[PDB]
Design a protein around this ligand. Structure first.
Ligand SMILES: O=[N+]([O-])c1ccc2nn[nH]c2c1
Length: 300
């Protein structure tokens, strides 16, 4: 039973998964994505270090493959991250002139979004912009440009492809009483009041066992920023307990602006934390108990 079909029947847009070329040609990933998921995201192939490893010299072979495959198989596409300290090649971090870095950032955003204009439902524009205490993270963009880099990034993205939904994403937004969760709400409200085109907040959700219950309170709090959409991104759950996964799905169903959920890969052995067996399919590509629990929850 397809969890994407079932979540669409409950009024949501998609159940998605991260993947890339060499996943689609190995294992049983392509068969499972075709049958059970409605949206694909490039795991790595759209990140800055993969797409612009030297200034102005773009690498699109891997991203092109994924976009083509998705179109051929009737899947939605999400993409990112346009601006994210974690995947930044060294040539960018060494820039010290404000105008140069603004131009570099704009060129990166505009080139990627133009190439796929009209084909991408959701773009993650800015990622991991916050410290755990809710202050802004001191990456090269904040240090050189200042806090205006976030408004500039979103304004540039909206002009490059007005059809795309534009998101800011971060992790550790999973507790309603954690400072980072209220801080991104505070800032996003302020930015949208200033006309910044932030369409969504994406929660990069890497949970430990038992943390699913708190998302029932955290996700409505993220929705109080007033963005048109919120999403769950890069989802995995240590231990893959049905209770944790069902709580995450119900948080999505409870929040009217939450459009869908993307899990961070298909099968456990291909996870960044495989020893925590945190995904919905096991190392033989069999659905795990959490997968069947989601199915039953969505049919209930
Ligand atoms: O939802 N995702 O799995 C996912 C993976 C990589 C990304 N880069 N930017 N946004 C992303 C979302």
């Amino acid at each position: 039973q397809s969890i994407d079909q079932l979540i669409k029947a409950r009024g949501k847009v998609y159940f998605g998964v991260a993947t890339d070329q060499n996943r689609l040609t190995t294992g049983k990933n392509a068969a499972i994505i075709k049958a059970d998921f409605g949206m694909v995201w490039p795991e790595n192939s759209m990140q800055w270090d993969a797409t612009e490893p030297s200034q102005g010299n773009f690498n699109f072979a891997g991203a092109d493959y994924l976009v083509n495959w998705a179109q051929q198989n009737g899947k939605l596409i999400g993409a990112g991250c346009l601006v994210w300290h974690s995947h930044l090649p060294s040539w960018v971090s060494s820039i010290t002139d404000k105008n140069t870095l603004i131009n570099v950032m704009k060129n990166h955003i505009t080139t990627l979004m133009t190439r796929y204009k009209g084909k991408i439902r959701t773009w993650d524009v800015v990622g991991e912009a916050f410290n755990e205490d809710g202050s802004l993270r001191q990456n090269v963009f904040l240090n050189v440009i200042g806090e205006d880099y976030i408004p500039i990034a979103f304004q540039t993205a909206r002009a490059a492809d007005p059809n795309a939904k534009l998101y800011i994403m971060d992790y550790n937004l999973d507790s309603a009483s954690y400072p980072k969760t209220q801080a991104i709400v505070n800032r996003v409200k302020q930015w949208r009041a200033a006309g910044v085109p932030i369409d969504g907040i994406g929660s990069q959700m890497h949970l430990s066992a038992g943390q699913g219950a708190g998302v029932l309170q955290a996700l409505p709090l993220l929705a109080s920023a007033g963005t048109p959409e919120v999403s769950i991104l890069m989802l995995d759950v240590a231990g893959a307990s049905p209770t944790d996964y069902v709580n995450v799905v119900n948080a999505c169903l409870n929040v009217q602006s939450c459009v869908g959920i993307t899990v961070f890969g298909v099968a456990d052995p291909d996870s960044w934390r495989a020893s925590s067996t945190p995904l919905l399919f096991d190392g033989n590509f069999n659905p795990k108990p959490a997968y069947n629990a989601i199915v039953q929850n969505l049919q209930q």
